[PDB]
């Protein structure tokens, strides 16, 4: 079984995700509306709002707050789009192969995202990733653990305290490995399947950067982004 310390990390992480993820999706009415690059303004608002949620989550991860501000920024800048890709599995639906955030105006099919500058060269692996992740049928405890392990990766450009960040990530992986073994029936090979999802996230990150770079370089398109997106997905060090 799990120790009280590991159980506490789980409670902190599950609560942190509950505070920063709103199943009502009611804040989406404040984004610039969707238009069927007509979807860029709405999706840039969607992502900008999600980056803020991911910063709130991170701050509540045990030990993240105690990193230097420099390391915190390097981890979030490198991992933001991956945490977002992960947390969106909660709205993704295997039925219609789309993200469904309450109503039909906030239902993003694959065609919607092409209207925001992304070719299917990127959207194909992204939806395959979401479908595989959905098929894993993760527990909430395992979903949040994965997001926290993704954020707390020391193999990111810019991090300085490798040793402290890797220790944090190891402790989280041990909680997860023990959670699966003790609490998840039939999860014999599930830990490995989630480590492989991390690697897929790195390949999706790189493809997103290529697509995003083309947006960021056309002022008529980059002007539609938000300042948070521009700063977080930008290359300043």
């Amino acid at each position: 079984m799990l120790s009280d310390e590991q159980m506490q990390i789980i409670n902190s992480l599950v609560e942190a995700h509950h505070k920063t993820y709103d199943d009502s999706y009611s804040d989406f009415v404040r984004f610039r509306p969707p238009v069927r690059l007509s979807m860029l303004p709405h999706l840039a608002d969607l992502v900008s709002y999600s980056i803020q949620k991911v910063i709130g989550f991170a701050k509540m991860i045990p030990g993240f707050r105690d990193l230097t501000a420099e390391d915190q920024i390097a981890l979030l800048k490198s991992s933001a789009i991956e945490i977002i890709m992960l947390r969106s599995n909660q709205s993704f639906s295997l039925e219609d192969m789309s993200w469904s955030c309450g109503g039909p105006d906030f239902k993003y099919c694959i065609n919607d995202v092409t209207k925001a500058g992304h070719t299917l060269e990127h959207l194909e692996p992204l939806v395959k990733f979401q479908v595989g992740l959905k098929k894993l049928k993760l527990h909430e405890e395992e979903h949040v653990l994965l997001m926290a392990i993704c954020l707390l990766s020391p193999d990111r450009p810019g991090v300085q305290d490798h040793v402290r960040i890797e220790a944090l990530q190891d402790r989280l992986c041990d909680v997860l490995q023990a959670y699966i073994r003790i609490q998840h029936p039939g999860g014999r090979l599930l830990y490995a399947k989630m480590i492989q999802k991390l690697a897929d996230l790195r390949s999706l990150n790189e493809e997103h950067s290529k697509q995003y770079r083309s947006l960021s370089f056309q002022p008529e398109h980059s002007m539609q982004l938000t300042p948070l997106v521009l700063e977080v997905f930008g290359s300043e060090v």
């Binding site: 803020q52 701050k59 501000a69 800048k77 300042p227 700063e231």
Partner: peptide, 9 residues
Amino acid sequence: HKILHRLLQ
């Protein structure tokens, strides 16, 4: 990173 720093605290 003015915004990130502010949001972090």
